[PDB]
CSV table of C-alpha atoms in Angstrom, one decimal:
chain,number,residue,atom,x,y,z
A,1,UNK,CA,128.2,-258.3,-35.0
A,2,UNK,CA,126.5,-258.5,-38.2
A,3,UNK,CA,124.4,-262.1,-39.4
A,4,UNK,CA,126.3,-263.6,-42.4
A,5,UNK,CA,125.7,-265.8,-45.0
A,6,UNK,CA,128.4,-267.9,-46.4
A,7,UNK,CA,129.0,-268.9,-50.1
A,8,UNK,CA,129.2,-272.8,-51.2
A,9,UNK,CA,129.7,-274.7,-54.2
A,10,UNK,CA,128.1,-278.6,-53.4
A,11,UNK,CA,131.7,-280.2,-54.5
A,12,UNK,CA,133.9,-277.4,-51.8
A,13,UNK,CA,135.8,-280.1,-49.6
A,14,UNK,CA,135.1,-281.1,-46.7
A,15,UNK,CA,136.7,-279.1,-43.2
A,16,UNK,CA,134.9,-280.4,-40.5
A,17,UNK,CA,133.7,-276.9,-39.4
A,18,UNK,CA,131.0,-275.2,-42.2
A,19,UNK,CA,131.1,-278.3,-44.8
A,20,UNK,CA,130.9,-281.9,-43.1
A,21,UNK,CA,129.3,-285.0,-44.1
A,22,UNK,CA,126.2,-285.4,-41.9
A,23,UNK,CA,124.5,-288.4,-40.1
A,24,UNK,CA,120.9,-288.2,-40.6
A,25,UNK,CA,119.4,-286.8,-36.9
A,26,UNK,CA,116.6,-289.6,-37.0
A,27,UNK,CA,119.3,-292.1,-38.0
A,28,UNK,CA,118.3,-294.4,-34.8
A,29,UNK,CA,114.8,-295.1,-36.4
A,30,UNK,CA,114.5,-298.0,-38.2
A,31,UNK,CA,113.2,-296.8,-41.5
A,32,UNK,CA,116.8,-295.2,-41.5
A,33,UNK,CA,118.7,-298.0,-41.5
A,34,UNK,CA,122.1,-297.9,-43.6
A,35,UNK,CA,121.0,-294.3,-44.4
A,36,UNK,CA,123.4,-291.5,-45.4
A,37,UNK,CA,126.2,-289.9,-44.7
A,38,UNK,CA,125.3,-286.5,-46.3
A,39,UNK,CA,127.0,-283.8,-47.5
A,40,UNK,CA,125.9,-280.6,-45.6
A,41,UNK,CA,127.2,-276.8,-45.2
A,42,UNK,CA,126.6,-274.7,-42.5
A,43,UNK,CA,125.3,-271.5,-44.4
A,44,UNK,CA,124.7,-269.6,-41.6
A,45,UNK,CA,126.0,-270.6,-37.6
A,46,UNK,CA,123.7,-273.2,-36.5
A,47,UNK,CA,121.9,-273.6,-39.9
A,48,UNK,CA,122.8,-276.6,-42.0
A,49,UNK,CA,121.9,-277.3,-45.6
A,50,UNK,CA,121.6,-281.1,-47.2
A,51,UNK,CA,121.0,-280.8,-50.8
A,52,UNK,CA,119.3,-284.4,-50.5
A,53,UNK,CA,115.6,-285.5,-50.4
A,54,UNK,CA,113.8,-285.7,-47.2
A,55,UNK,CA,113.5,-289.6,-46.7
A,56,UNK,CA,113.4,-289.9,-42.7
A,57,UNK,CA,109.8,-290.3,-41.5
A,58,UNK,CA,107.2,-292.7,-42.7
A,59,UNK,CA,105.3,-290.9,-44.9
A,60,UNK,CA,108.7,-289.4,-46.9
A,61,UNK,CA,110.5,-293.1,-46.7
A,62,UNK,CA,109.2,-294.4,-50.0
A,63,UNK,CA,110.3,-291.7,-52.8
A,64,UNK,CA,108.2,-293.6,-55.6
A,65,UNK,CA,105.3,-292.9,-57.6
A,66,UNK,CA,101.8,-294.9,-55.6
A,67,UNK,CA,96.8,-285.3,-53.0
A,68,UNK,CA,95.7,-284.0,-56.3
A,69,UNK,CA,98.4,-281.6,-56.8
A,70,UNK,CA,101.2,-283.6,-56.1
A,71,UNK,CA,104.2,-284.1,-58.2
A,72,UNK,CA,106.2,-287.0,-58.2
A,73,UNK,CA,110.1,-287.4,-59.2
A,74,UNK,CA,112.1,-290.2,-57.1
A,75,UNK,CA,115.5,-289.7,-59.7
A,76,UNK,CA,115.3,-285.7,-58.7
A,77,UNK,CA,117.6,-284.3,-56.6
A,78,UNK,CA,120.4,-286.9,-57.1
A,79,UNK,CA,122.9,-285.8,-59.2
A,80,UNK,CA,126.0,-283.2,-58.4
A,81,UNK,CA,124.8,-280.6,-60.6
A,82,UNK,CA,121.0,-280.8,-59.2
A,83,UNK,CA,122.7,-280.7,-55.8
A,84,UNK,CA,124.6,-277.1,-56.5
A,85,UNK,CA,121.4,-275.7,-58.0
A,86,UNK,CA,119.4,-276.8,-55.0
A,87,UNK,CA,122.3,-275.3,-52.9
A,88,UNK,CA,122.3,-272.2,-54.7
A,89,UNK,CA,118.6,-271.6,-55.0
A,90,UNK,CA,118.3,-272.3,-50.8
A,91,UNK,CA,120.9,-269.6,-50.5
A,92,UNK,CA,119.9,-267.1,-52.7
A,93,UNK,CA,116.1,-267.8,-50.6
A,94,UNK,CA,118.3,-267.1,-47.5
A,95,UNK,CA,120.0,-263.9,-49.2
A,96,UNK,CA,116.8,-262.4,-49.9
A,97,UNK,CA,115.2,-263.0,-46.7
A,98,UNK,CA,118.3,-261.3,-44.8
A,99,UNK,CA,118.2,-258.2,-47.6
A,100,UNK,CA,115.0,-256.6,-45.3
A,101,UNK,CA,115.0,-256.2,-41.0
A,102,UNK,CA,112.2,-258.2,-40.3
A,103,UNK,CA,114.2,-261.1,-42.1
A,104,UNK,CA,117.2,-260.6,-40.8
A,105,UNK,CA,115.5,-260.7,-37.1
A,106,UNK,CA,113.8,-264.3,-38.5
A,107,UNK,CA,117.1,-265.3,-39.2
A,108,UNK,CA,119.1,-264.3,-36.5
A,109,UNK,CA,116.5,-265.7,-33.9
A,110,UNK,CA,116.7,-269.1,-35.2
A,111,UNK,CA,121.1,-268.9,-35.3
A,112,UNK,CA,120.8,-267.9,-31.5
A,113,UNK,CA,117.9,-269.8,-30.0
A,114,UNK,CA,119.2,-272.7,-29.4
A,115,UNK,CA,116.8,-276.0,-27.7
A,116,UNK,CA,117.5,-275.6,-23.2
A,117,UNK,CA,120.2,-277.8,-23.1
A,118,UNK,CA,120.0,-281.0,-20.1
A,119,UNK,CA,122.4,-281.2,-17.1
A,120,UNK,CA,125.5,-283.2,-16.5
A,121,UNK,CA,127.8,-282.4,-13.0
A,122,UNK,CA,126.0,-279.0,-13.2
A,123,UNK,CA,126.9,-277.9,-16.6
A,124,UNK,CA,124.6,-277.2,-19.8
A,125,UNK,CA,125.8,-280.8,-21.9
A,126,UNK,CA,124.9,-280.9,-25.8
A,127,UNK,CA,122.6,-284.1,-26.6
A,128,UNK,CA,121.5,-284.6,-29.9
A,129,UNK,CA,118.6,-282.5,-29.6
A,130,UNK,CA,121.1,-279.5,-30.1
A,131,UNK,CA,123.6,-281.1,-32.6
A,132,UNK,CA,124.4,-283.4,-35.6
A,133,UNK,CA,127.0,-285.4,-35.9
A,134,UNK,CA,130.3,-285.4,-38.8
A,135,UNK,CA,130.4,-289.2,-39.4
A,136,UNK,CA,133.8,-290.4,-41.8
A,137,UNK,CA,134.5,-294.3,-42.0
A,138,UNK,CA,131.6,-295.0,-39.8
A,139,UNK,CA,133.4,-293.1,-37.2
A,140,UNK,CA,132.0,-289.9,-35.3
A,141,UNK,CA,134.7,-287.6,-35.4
A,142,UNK,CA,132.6,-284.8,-34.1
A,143,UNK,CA,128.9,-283.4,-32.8
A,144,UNK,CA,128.6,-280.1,-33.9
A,145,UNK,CA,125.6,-277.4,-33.2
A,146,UNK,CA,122.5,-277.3,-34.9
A,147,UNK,CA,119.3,-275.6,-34.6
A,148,UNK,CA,117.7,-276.1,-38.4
A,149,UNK,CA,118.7,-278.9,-41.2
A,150,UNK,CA,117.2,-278.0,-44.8
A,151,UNK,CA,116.7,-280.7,-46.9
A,152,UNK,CA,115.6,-281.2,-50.9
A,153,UNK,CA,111.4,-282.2,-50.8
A,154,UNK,CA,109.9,-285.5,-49.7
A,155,UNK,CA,107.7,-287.6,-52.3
A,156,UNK,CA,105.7,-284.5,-54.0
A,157,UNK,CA,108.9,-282.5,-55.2
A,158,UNK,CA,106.8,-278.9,-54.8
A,159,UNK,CA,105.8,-280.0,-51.0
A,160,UNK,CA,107.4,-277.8,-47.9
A,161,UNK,CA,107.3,-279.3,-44.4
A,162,UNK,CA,109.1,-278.8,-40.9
A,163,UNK,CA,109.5,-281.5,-38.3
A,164,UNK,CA,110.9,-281.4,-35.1
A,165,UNK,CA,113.4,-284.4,-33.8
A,166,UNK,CA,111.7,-284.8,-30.3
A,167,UNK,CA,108.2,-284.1,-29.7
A,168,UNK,CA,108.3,-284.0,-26.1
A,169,UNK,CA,110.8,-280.9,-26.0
A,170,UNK,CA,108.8,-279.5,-28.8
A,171,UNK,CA,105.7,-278.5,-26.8
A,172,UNK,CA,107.0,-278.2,-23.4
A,173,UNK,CA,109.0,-275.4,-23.4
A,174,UNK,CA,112.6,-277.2,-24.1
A,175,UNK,CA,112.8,-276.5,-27.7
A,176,UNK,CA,114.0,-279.2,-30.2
A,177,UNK,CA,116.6,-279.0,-33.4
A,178,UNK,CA,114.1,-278.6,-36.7
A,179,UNK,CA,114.1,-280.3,-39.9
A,180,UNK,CA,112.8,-278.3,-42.8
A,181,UNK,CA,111.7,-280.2,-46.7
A,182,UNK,CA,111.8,-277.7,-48.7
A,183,UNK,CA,111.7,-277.1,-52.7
A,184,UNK,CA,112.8,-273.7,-54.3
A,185,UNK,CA,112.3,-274.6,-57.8
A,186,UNK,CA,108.8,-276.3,-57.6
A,187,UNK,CA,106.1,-274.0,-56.6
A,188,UNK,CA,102.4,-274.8,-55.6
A,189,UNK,CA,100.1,-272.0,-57.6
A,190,UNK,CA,97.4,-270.3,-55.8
A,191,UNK,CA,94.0,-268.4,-56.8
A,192,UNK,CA,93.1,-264.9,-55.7
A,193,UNK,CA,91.4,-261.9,-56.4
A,194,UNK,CA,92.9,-259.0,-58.5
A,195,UNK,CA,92.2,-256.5,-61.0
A,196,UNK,CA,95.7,-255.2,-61.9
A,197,UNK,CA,96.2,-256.9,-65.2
A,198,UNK,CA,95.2,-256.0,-68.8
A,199,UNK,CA,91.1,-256.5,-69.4
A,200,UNK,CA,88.8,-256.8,-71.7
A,201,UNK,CA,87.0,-253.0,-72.2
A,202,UNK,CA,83.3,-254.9,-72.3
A,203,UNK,CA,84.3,-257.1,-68.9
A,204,UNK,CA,81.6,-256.4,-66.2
A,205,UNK,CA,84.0,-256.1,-63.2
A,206,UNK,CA,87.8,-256.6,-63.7
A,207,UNK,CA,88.5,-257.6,-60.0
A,208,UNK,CA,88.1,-261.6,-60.8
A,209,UNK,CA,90.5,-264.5,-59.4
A,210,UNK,CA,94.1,-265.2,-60.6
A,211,UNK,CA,96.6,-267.6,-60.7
A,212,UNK,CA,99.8,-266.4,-59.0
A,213,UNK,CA,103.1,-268.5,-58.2
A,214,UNK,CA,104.0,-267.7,-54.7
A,215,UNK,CA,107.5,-266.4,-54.1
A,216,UNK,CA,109.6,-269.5,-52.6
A,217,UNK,CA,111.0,-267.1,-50.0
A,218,UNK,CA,107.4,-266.3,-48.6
A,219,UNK,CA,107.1,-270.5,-48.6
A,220,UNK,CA,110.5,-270.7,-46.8
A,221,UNK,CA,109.4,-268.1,-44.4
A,222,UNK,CA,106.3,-269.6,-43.4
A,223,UNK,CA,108.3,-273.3,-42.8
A,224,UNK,CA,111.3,-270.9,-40.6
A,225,UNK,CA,108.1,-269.9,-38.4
A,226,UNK,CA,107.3,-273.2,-37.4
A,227,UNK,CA,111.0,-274.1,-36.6
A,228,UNK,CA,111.0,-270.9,-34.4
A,229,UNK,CA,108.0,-271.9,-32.5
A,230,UNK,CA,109.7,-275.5,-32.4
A,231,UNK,CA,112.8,-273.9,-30.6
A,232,UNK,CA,110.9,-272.0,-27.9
A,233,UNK,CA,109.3,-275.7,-27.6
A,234,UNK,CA,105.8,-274.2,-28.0
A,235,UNK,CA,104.8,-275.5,-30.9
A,236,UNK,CA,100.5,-275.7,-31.2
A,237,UNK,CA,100.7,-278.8,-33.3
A,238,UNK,CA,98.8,-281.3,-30.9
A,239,UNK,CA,95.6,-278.4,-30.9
A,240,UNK,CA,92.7,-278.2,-33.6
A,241,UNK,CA,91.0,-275.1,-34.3
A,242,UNK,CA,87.5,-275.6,-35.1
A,243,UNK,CA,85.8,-272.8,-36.8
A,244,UNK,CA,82.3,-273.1,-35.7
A,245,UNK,CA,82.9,-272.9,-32.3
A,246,UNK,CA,86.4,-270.5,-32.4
A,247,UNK,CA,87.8,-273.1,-29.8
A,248,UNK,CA,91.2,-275.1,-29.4
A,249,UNK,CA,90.0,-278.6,-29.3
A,250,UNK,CA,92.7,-282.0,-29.1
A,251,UNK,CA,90.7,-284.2,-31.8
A,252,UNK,CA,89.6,-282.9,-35.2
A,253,UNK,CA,86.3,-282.0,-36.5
A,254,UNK,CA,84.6,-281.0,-39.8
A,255,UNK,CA,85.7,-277.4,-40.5
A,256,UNK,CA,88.7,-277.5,-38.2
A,257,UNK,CA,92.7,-276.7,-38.7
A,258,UNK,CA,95.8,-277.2,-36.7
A,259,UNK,CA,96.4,-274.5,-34.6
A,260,UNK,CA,100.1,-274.2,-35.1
A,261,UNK,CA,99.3,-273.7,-39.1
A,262,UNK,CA,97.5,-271.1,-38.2
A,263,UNK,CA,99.1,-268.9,-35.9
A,264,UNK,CA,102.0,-270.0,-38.7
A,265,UNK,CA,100.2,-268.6,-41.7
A,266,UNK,CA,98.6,-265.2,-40.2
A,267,UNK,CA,95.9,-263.0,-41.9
A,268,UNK,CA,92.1,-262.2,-41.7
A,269,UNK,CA,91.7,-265.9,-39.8
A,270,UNK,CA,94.9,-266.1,-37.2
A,271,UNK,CA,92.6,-262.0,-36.2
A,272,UNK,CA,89.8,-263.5,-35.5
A,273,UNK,CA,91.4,-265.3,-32.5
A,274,UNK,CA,89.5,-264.7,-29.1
A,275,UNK,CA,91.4,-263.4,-26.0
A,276,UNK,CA,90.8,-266.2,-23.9
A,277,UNK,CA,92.8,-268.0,-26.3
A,278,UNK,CA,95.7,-265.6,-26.5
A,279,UNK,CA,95.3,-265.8,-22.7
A,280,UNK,CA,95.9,-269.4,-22.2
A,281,UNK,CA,98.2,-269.8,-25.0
A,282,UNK,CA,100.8,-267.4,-23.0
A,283,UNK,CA,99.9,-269.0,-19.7
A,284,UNK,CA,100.9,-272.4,-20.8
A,285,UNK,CA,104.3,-271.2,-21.9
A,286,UNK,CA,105.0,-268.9,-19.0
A,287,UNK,CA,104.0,-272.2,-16.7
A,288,UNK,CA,106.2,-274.5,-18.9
A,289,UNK,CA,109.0,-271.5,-18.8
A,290,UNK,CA,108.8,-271.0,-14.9
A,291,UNK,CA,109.1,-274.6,-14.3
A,292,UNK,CA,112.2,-275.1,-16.5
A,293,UNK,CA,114.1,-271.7,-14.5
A,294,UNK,CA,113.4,-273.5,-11.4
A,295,UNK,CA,113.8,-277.8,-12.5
A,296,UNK,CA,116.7,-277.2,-14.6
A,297,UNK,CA,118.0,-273.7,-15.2
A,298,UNK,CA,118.8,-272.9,-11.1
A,299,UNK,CA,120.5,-276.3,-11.3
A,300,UNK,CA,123.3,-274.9,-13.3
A,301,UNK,CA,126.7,-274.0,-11.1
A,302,UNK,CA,129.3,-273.9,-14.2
A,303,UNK,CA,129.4,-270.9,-16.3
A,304,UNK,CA,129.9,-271.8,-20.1
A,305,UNK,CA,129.1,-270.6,-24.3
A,306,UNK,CA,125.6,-272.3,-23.5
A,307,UNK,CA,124.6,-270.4,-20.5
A,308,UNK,CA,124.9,-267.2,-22.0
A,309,UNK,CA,123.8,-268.2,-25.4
A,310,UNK,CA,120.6,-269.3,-22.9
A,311,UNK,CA,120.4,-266.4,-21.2
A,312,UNK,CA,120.0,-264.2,-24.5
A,313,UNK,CA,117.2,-266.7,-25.2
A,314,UNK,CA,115.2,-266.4,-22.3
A,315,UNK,CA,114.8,-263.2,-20.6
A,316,UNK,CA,115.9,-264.0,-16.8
A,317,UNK,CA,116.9,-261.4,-13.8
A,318,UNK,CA,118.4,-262.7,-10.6
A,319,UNK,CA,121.7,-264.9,-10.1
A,320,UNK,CA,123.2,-268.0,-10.4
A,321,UNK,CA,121.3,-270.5,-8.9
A,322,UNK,CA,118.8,-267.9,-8.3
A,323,UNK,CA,117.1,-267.1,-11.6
A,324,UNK,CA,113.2,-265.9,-12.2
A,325,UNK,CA,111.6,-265.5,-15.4
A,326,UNK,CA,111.5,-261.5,-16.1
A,327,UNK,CA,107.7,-262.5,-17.0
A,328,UNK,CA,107.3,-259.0,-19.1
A,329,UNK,CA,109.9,-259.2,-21.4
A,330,UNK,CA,109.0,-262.9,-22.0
A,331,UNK,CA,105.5,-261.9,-22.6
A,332,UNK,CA,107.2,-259.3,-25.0
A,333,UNK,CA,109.3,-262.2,-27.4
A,334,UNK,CA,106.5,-264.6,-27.0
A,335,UNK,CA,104.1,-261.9,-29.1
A,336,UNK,CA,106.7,-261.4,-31.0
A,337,UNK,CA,107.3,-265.5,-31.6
A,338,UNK,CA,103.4,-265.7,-31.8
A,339,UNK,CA,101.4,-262.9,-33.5
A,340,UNK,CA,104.2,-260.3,-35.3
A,341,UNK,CA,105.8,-263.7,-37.1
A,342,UNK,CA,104.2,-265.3,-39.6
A,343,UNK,CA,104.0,-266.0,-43.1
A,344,UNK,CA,101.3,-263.3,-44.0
A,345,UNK,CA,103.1,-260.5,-41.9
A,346,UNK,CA,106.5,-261.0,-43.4
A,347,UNK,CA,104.9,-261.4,-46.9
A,348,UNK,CA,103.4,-257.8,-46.4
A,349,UNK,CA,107.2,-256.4,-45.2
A,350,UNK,CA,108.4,-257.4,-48.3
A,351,UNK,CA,105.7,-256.8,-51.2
A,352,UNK,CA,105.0,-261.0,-51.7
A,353,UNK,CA,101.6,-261.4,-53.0
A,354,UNK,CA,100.3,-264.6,-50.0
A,355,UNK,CA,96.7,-266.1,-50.2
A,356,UNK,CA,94.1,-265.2,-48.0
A,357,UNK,CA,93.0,-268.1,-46.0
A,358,UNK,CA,96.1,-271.3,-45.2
A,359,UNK,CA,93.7,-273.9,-46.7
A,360,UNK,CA,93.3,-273.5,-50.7
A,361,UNK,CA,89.9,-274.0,-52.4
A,362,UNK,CA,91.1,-276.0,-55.6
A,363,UNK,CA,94.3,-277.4,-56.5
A,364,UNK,CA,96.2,-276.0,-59.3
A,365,UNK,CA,99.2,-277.9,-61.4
A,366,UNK,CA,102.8,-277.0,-59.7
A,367,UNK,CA,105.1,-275.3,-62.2
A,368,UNK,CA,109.0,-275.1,-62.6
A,369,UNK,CA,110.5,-271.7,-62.5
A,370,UNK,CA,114.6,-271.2,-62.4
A,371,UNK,CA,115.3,-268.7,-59.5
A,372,UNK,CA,118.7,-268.9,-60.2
A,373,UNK,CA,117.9,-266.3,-63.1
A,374,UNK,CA,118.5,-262.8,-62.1
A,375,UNK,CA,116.0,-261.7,-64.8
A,376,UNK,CA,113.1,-264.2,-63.6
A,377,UNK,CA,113.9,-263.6,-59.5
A,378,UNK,CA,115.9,-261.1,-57.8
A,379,UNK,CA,117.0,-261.2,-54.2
A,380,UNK,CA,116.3,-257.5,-53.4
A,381,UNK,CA,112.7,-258.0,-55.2
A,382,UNK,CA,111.4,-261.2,-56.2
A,383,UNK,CA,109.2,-261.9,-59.2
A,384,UNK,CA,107.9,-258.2,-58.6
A,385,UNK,CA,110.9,-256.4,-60.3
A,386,UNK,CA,109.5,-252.5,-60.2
A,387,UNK,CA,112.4,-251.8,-63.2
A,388,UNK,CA,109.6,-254.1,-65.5
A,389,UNK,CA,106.9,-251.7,-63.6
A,390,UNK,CA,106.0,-254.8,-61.2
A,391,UNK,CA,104.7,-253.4,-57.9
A,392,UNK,CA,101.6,-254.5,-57.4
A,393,UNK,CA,102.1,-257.7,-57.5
A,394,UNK,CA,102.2,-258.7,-61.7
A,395,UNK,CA,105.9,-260.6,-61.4
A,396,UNK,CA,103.7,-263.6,-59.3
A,397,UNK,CA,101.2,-263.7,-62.2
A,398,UNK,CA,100.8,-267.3,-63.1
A,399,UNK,CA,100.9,-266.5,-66.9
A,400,UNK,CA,104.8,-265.1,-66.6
A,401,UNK,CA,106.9,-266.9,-68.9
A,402,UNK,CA,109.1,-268.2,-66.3
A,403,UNK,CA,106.8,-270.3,-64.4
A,404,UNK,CA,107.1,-273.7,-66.7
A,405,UNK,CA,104.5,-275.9,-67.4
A,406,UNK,CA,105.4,-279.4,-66.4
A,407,UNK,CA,104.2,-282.2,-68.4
A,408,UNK,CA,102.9,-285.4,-65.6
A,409,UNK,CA,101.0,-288.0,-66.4
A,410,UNK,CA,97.7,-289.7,-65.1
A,411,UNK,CA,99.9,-291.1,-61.7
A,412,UNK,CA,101.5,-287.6,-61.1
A,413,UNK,CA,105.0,-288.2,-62.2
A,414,UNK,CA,107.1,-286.2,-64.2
A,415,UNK,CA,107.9,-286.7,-67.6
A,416,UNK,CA,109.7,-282.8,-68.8
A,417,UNK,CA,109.2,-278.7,-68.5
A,418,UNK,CA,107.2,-278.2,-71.8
């Protein structure tokens, strides 16, 4: 069957099946207290979408004014009609991530791959790792399955993150339901070389630095990579990679970044990865994966929806009771999950203009750019619209009319869009 998005206005009532009001997953937590519910549509199966800000760990509790390109907002993000264009932006991201294969793929993969369910009286039992919950009148009326939420931005209102709800399951093959903060209308700038604009005749060498805006669906991309990895459960979050050495190390050093960003981000660094790496990267999930067939998955005698959506997950051969790892097909999807993914690879796939190295040299001043207009962003193309003769790259020039200035002050908060 074919992967389909489906169509929302914020105020569509509520049915209990694709629009619900939501409890927040990390509701237990006592920063969370009193919090929610939240209105939240299930754009595509599994995939939820809370046009709220992401308020549910420490650092995203306090929404308030206190990085140097931050941008800071608490009042965004909190009235009906910022709600529906945060609701249609995320979809029309969505929409033009499906619109090429290697998108669609991304997409589907996180609808199907659900976190390996526990055991009850020998069935695969939903916990809350795999669902959220429709709360009405402080009763819950039902759990319902989730794989991804996507929430407004934290604190700085052009900030993207993911975070997964339990960080044992994240890393040990399991696989845990993802939270993504993310912000289609408030993009971080970025410099890089290029010499495909209109020069000066006297200039000594055109091919100088630029300021582009990246295209939010590229930023969304890169945060639906990380969920991925967070659903096989082998997210590299806990590892550093130091590049002196070209090691994985546990604690951080001087010129050192988190493996999972990465892997995650792609390009001339994630190539430059040593074998012995790769090696024990895919021996550690094979181990974890092994372990689970045999602990958990052999300890399954009732045929439901959650062993065969587990089956198409993880490539197994044998019977029930009597399953094995089919080792090279899982070596197969975990390249796939590891090396083919990531936010540099998919950019390339779909003519997005990414930086070259994850960690930028300078900051630069976010911007404000309305997705929503078909002339500014299209689904099928971006910024880079070739009918305006944009194909190599020019639509993500910073200097485009529709990336806004944004007037902050000293303290980072916003005062208006100049």
């Amino acid at each position: 069957m074919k992967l389909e998005i489906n169509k929302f206005n914020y105020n569509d009532p509520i049915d209990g099946i694709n629009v619900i009001t939501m409890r927040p997953p990390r509701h237990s937590d006592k920063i969370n207290k009193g919090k929610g519910p939240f209105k939240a549509f299930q754009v595509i199966k599994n995939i939820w979408i809370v046009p709220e800000r992401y308020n549910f760990t420490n650092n995203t509790n306090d929404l308030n004014i206190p990085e140097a390109d931050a941008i800071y907002n608490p009042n965004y993000l909190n009235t009906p009609s910022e709600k529906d264009e945060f609701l249609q932006g995320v979809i029309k991201v969505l929409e033009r991530i499906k619109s090429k294969p290697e998108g669609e793929k991304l997409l589907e993969l996180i609808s199907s791959s659900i976190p390996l369910p526990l055991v009850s009286n020998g069935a695969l039992t939903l916990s809350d790792n795999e669902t959220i919950a429709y709360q009405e009148n402080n009763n819950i009326v039902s759990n319902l399955q989730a794989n991804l939420v996507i929430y407004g931005p934290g604190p700085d209102i052009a900030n993207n993150a993911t975070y997964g709800l339990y960080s044992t399951p994240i890393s040990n093959g399991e696989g845990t339901l993802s939270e993504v903060s993310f912000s289609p209308f408030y993009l971080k700038p970025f410099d890089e070389s290029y010499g495909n604009y209109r020069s000066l005749v006297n200039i000594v060498n055109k091919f100088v630095k630029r300021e582009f805006a990246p295209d939010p669906a590229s930023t969304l991309m890169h945060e639906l990579v990380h969920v991925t990895h967070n659903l096989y459960g082998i997210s590299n979050r806990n590892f550093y990679y130091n590049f002196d050495t070209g090691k994985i190390e546990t604690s951080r050093q001087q010129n050192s970044l988190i493996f999972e960003e990465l892997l995650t981000f792609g390009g001339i660094d994630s190539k430059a990865i040593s074998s012995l790496i790769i090696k024990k990267i895919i021996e550690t999930a094979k181990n974890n994966y092994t372990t689970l067939i045999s602990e958990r998955l052999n300890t399954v005698t009732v045929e439901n929806d959650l062993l065969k959506y587990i089956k198409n997950k993880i490539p197994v051969q044998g019977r029930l009771g009597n399953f094995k790892l089919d080792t090279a097909e899982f070596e197969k999807k975990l390249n796939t999950i590891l090396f083919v993914l990531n936010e540099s690879n998919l950019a390339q796939r779909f003519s997005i203009l990414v930086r070259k190295h994850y960690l930028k040299e300078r900051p630069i001043d976010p911007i404000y750019v309305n997705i929503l207009d078909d002339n500014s962003y299209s689904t099928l193309e971006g910024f880079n619209i070739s009918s305006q003769g944009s194909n190599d790259f020019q639509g993500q020039l910073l200097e485009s009319s529709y990336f806004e200035k944004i007037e902050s002050n000293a303290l980072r908060a916003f005062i208006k869009i100049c």
